[PDB]
Design a protein around this ligand. Sequence first.
Ligand SMILES: CCCCCCCCCCCCCCCCCC(=O)OC[C@H](COP(=O)(O)OCCN)OC(=O)CCCCCCCCCCCCCCCCC
Ligand SMILES: CCCCCCCCCCCCCCCCCC(=O)OC[C@H](COP(=O)(O)OCCN)OC(=O)CCCCCCCCCCCCCCCCC
Ligand SMILES: CCCCCCCCCCCCCCCCCC(=O)OC[C@H](COP(=O)(O)OCCN)OC(=O)CCCCCCCCCCCCCCCCC
Ligand SMILES: CCCCCCCCCCCCCCCCCC(=O)OC[C@H](COP(=O)(O)OCCN)OC(=O)CCCCCCCCCCCCCCCCC
Lengths: 598, 504
Amino acid sequence: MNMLALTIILPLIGFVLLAFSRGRWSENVSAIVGVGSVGLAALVTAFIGVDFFANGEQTYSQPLWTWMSVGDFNIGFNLVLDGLSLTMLSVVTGVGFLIHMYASWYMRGEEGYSRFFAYTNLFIASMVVLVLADNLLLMYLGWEGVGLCSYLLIGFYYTDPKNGAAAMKAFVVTRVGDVFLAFALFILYNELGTLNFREMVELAPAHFADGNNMLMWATLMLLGGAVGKSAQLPLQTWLADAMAGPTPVSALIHAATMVTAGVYLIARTHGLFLMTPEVLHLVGIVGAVTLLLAGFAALVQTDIKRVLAYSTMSQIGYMFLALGVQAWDAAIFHLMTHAFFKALLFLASGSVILACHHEQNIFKMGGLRKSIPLVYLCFLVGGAALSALPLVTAGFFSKDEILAGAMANGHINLMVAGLVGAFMTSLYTFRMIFIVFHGSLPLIVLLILSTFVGALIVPPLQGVLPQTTELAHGSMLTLEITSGVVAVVGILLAAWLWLGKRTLVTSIANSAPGRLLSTWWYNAWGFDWLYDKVFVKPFLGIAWLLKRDPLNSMMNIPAVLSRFAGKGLLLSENGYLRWYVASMSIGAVVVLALLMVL
Amino acid sequence: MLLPWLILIPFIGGFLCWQTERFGVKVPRWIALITMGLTLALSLQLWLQGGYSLTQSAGIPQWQSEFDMPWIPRFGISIHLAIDGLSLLMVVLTGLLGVLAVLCSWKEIEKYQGFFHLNLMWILGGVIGVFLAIDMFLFFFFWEMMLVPMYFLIALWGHKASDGKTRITAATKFFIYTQASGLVMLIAILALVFVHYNATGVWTFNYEELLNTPMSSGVEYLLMLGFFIAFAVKMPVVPLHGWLPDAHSQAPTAGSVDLAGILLKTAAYGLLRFSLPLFPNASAEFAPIAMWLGVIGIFYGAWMAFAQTDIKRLIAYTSVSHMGFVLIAIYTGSQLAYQGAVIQMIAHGLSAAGLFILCGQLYERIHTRDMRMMGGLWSKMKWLPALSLFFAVATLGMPGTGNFVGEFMILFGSFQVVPVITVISTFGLVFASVYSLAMLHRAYFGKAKSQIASQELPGMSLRELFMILLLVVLLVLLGFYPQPILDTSHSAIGNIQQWFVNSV
Ligand SMILES: CCCCCCCCCCCCCCCCCC(=O)OC[C@H](COP(=O)(O)OCCN)OC(=O)CCCCCCCCCCCCCCCCC
Ligand SMILES: CCCCCCCCCCCCCCCCCC(=O)OC[C@H](COP(=O)(O)OCCN)OC(=O)CCCCCCCCCCCCCCCCC
Ligand SMILES: CCCCCCCCCCCCCCCCCC(=O)OC[C@H](COP(=O)(O)OCCN)OC(=O)CCCCCCCCCCCCCCCCC
Ligand SMILES: CCCCCCCCCCCCCCCCCC(=O)OC[C@H](COP(=O)(O)OCCN)OC(=O)CCCCCCCCCCCCCCCCC
């Protein structure tokens, strides 16, 4: 498995070739280069996994070179591979290859074809760097490259300024998250003296024996970086606006790479969070609140992609809740399954927006189950996996593992939040499906993987993440029964509300608290307005106030004083001889008086 | 031995460029080309033969090469040149920028091209003399002699779209700022020399002899203040900064003149070389003031850059913010922060040179600099918007470029010393990403906001493309492998840091 660096090099080679080609190549050649780069990365990933399982799941290390060596500051360019890294790398490469093939079919006849595939190749390379890094600075390089490619891909259609504004907002919010992550890096290097994950875990208990404040600061800042990248509380506002990009961009962001980076960051530095239990409980609380707010926002969204955005936010909140209840394996399994069905849902939504030919809200569409039966089937199974349909969907098993972890660690409020979030998840998902639809090889692969066939795949996290506290069989069985009952009740309530003629739904919507709650939850609980008022508006006001460069004028004040003093002094040069004699006598008086005084 | 030739080859080359103009108008550009080729080759030969990676830290003074020749023996003044890792790195950077400036002014067929090349060569020779001189009078002499050709270039060859009055005003403001600050530095130098003469009894302007000077707390503060006023004017440090956007705005339109002398790389070298070793206690006492001035510089430069309708002024304020980062790094006493300052300085030189070259190329394309008059230029050009996108990504501190590497070692060392200024500086990094994305959106994205950007534009020439791609390759290699640069300057940085922290 010594070709571990090829998983970075091949997307990098593809990105460089497709960038310097500048779109002069044919679309077939550009598609071949991009999809072949990601497919060769996926094939090398498959061979790496085969050699990993053949060698007995041994953590492999490939040190390429040394990044920077200044005294004790030794940061190496080393790749690592364990079960978590293999799971993340396989998910990223496989789902990215499927999305690349679908985009090669999808983006035909579009300007910037080579540019699009170069940007996605750089995205894949950046996330492979992120998930293969052995220290925090190389992971930061992959982190910021992932953010940069997100900026380049959200505002892909640069002619529309709305896409550029959305990309700028996404990059600024994720840059605030990366600044929090940088704070975590600074604290961890200042305390432990290293940024390698294994060494930080090893020397964390030996160093924080006397005082344990800076470790909570570092883990809190790590959580801030994670919620910056994973679109969680309080930095979740960028995703819904970032939906302005192309469909494969949205699938690659919400399913495979972008939002899973925070979950991988929390799972990779799990030991430091284990020594800071309050911060881990804060991770769980942030996940619960974010999934609840995302479900409430998705309940009233009028567009398919906005519903999918808040569903992605809710699922990532479920992962964060799983991490907060020390259900790490449940979190990574849900990451895999959510990547599968969210990619399937986004590609099906792109098929819907190709069939509709115009940007329309969900109410204008109706009765689409007969015009597009394959797309309707894909949407139906993606919604069933998202809503955790029992015994047929992998999302059901992932959510059951998450809720079992919530049970076994004594977390009751997080369990209640999870069940409520599952109920509203089924509610908004089948609300969208019943509103829209009543009134191909990547698609086949994601069709299969969204069912229990995806649940057949388990991540090899033994020996990497700690094994969860084991629930009793009766408690696990009644929790599975409760989860299935809640999901079925939510789906049936959505059918009772939106499948027929909407009279109870419109009566609630036409109530004055209906207007208030619909307008509140439509704008993501006012967080976008709050960040506009608290941060954007004073920034713009200070920029407008400072655009005249006041310090430059303050330092130009001596020039004005010199000009005024020179003009005042030139009044003595009136050219009158009698005044010159008078001035000489005045100076004689002044000199004589000064000599007499001193 | 090669240091006098390192200084004199630009001067002799400029004289030959001026005198050989009678053989044709296409002759002096070649003469400047082998002039900077010889200068860069001498710098690289000194790099190869210096053995800088194997050099340990032996304390100030520790020079890899030295030259001494008496100039004014009445005051103990000599042409005293010395090179170590830091000075060699900056001489290599100056030679590379001189090569790029000769290449960027290749198509100028002006009637007085020989004098333009002479002024460019004399500016570069003055900058190299600043980096090499370890005599205080000689250092001040180079520091002030690099200003007259700069003044004449800005005043007489400058931005032809603007009036001559605006160019003369900007050049006069730059000259007054730099020369008044230099005179304050000369007063500090004279007072230090006289104090050393009163303490010991030998006339000497030598930097090695003035290191050990018994000085009261309060005289040392005043001398450090004079040195810091000079360096802060040419750093730039707020509020002594506006000469830099005014000089960048009214510089000649080639863009070579921007790379020649208006790029700031000598003041932080002077702070590391002279302000910290000569006055360690005064610098330690002044460190909170300088670090807060750096914080104010970062935030003020970012807000200034966002509020610009001119792209060249935006790049100038980007330089202001980055140099505020370097100023924070200098007054920390951390070897990690100093090495990060060196990497950030080299990377800022490369990235600012690329941005200024691309802005100049855009100006010969569209004949305007207003970002309100351009938009959607990604579809109208071939190479320029993608390279400008890369350089804007570089200037916001993205990993993969040397800017991130330098500024992150700066922030690591600063947080090891001072946490609060470090966190405010990282919010300044957020602001840097904000203004870089704002300039990218206002310049190359969107629709055409005027008629000059509506039609297709001619592609970039092969020479300009080759030098811009050389800058791109150098920035990427510095980001992914800064280790030769860190090994070159490790001994000098170690000596400066050990002197700063072992005498306070
Ligand atoms: C983050 C992405 C993953 C990294 C790969 C791509 C990075 C960017 C590519 C351009 C910059 C490359 C800089 C390094 C070039 C190789 C030189 C090198 O690193 O030598 C060090 C080492 C040998 O010296 P050693 O003494 O072992 O060093 C350790 C310190 N004592 O050398 C070795 O031990 C051998 C190392 C071989 C590495 C080969 C990598 C080839 C990459 C080709 C990329 C093509 C696209 C480039 C542009 C991409 C976009 C920026
Ligand atoms: C490293 C692994 C990942 C880890 C994270 C890394 C994060 C940082 C990575 C930074 C890389 C650069 C990103 C920003 C610049 C992107 C430029 C771009 O958009 O290129 C596309 C463009 C072609 O697009 P198109 O619109 O079709 O062409 C216009 C013509 N009408 O292309 C062009 O017009 C031509 C190419 C322009 C410049 C491309 C980027 C240059 C820098 C990378 C390669 C450097 C050279 C390789 C060798 C390095 C040294 C060994
Ligand atoms: C932050 C405090 C601590 C640090 C202090 C550092 C001090 C030294 C470095 C800063 C020097 C600042 C110099 C300010 C003036 C620069 C030149 C300038 O702005 O000129 C503008 C103007 C010429 O242009 P224009 O406006 O077109 O006028 C045409 C008039 N027919 O000019 C004119 O019309 C007249 C110009 C007269 C000459 C310039 C003014 C000299 C004044 C004394 C300078 C010495 C410092 C004194 C203290 C400064 C404040 C601390
Ligand atoms: C999350 C809550 C918890 C707190 C954590 C820290 C704070 C995080 C806050 C994140 C807020 C991000 C908001 C980003 C909005 C971007 C979109 C936007 O407003 O776009 C409008 C405009 C577009 O830019 P332009 O290129 O001019 O467009 C051309 C035509 N419009 O864009 C502009 O004009 C530029 C707007 C720049 C906004 C800068 C934001 C700076 C944030 C500083 C954080 C400081 C944190 C510490 C605060 C004190 C704490 C005690």
